[PDB]
């Protein structure tokens, strides 16, 4: 729904500004995966350190959605699980959207 709520024109322009001003960070849109039974997330736009790993970003989501650690969280990009050890800069480089943002989804088990 991020894409539905913001025209492609405006998405592209905001991504260009952020990449110019904060080159050591990655603009990420985070949304809950379709049909997932875990909590929706309040804020969708995250400016992430390039060196942050996927696994470390799982902890970020956990703190927002206030999910007990007994229950697992998985991050997807383009419907596939990226490696936990991968740095956000790498996922961006390889899977960034045409609008300049990286789109992530998350779910539980």
């Amino acid at each position: 729904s991020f894409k539905k709520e913001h025209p492609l024109e405006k998405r592209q322009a905001e991504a260009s500004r952020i990449r110019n001003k904060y080159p050591d960070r990655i603009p990420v849109i985070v949304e809950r995966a379709e049909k997932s039974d875990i909590p929706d997330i309040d804020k969708k736009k995250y400016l992430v350190p390039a060196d942050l790993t996927v696994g470390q970003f799982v902890f970020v989501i956990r703190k927002r959605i206030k999910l007990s650690a007994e229950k697992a969280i998985f991050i997807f990009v383009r419907n596939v699980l990226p490696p936990t050890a991968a740095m956000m800069s790498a996922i961006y480089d390889e899977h960034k959207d045409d609008d300049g943002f990286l789109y992530l989804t998350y779910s539980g088990e």
């Binding site: 952020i18 603009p27 736009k45 995250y46 400016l47 992430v48 350190p49 942050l52 970003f57 970020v60």
Partner: peptide, 5 residues
């Protein structure tokens, strides 16, 4: 506004 991690 952006969330900053």
């Amino acid at each position: 506004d952006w969330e900053i991690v």
